[PDB]
Design a binder for this molecule. Structure first.
Ligand SMILES: CNc1ncc2c(n1)N([C@H]1CCN(C(=O)/C=C/CN(C)C)C1)C(=O)N(c1c(Cl)c(OC)cc(OC)c1Cl)C2
Length: 276
């Protein structure tokens, strides 16, 4: 089996497995994560292999864990909290986000015709920019750790009980988030992540809209190649649309960095009305 790591190891009986969250991941309660508060129960997410899993499933699960150990903590990513590795099935314990992924979160907050609400309080203008800011801060951290996401999208951002945005699945139809060069040449970089972030911004200001509506996958390259970009969302400022457009620069060296996006978003947030 797999070697013990006491920095992360939690005894199996410290975990009370609860309800399934999605496929596999379960909600649970962890007893004594903090060695200094050993009688407190914390709600956590636990990832385990499905009953029909292959050896590449196991080894991928291990690599995810190992990778998350190296990346370190940041408030705007989903953080590693612990693991059960010895007494039986591998369990990887990470932070729980009670409000689900950002796509569902936004859709549930649509006003009740051309983008119906599939379920909450609408999000103010400032809240939407602030959501963008947080995602960018998380991506800025990951980039500073030399971590390339490769599948950044609103589905891969989760939202906590306190509405903190946390990048998900950074340790591993998705073609609609891929930079042209990722698609064509399978060249993945921080710069391709910035492309994906611009699609994510479009998602934010469409309140979970589907990118490139009606465009079949097999034509998307040619179109992008030809200068096709998505139209401004109806309720998006010209300035935030220019950001999206910059993220979608054809030349990857000409895209802004996440460092820059964070600074730009920090200022826009400060200037954006809470009243809207
Ligand atoms: C829903 N709340 C929630 N909170 C925390 C997690 C988490 N989910 N999951 C998946 C579980 C199902 N998810 C969804 O977005 C499901 C959407 C379908 N609707 C109906 C809710 C996210 C995860 O996959 N998370 C997860 C887990 Cl378990 C990891 O384990 C190592 C590593 C991760 O990032 C590198 C992440 Cl994001 C943890």
């Amino acid at each position: 089996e797999l070697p013990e790591d006491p920095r992360w190891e939690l005894p199996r009986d410290r975990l009370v497995l609860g309800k399934p969250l999605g496929e596999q991941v379960v909600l649970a309660e962890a007893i004594g994560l903090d060695k200094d508060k050993p009688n407190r129960v914390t709600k956590v997410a636990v990832k385990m292999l499905k009953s029909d899993a292959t050896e590449k499933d196991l080894s991928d699960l291990i690599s995810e864990m190992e990778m998350m150990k190296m990346i370190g903590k940041h408030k705007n990513i989903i953080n590693l909290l612990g693991a059960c590795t010895q007494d039986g099935p591998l369990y990887v314990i990470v932070e729980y986000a009670s409000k689900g992924n950002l796509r569902e979160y936004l859709q549930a907050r649509r006003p009740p015709e051309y983008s119906y609400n599939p379920s909450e309080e609408q999000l103010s203008s400032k809240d939407l920019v602030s959501c963008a800011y947080q995602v960018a801060r998380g991506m800025e951290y990951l980039a500073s750790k030399k971590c390339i996401h490769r599948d950044l999208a609103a589905r891969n951002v989760l939202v906590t009980e306190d509405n903190v945005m946390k990048i998900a699945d950074f340790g591993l139809l998705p073609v609609k988030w891929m930079a042209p060069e990722a698609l064509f040449d399978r060249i993945y970089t921080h710069q391709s992540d910035v492309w994906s972030f611009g699609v994510l911004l479009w998602e934010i200001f469409t309140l979970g809209g589907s990118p490139y509506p009606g465009v079949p996958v097999e034509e998307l390259f040619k179109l992008l190649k030809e200068g096709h970009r998505m139209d401004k969302p109806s309720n998006c400022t010209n300035e935030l649309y220019m950001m999206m457009r910059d993220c979608w620069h054809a030349v990857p060296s000409q895209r802004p960095t996440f460092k820059q996006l964070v600074e730009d978003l920090d200022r826009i947030v400060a200037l954006t009305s809470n009243q809207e």
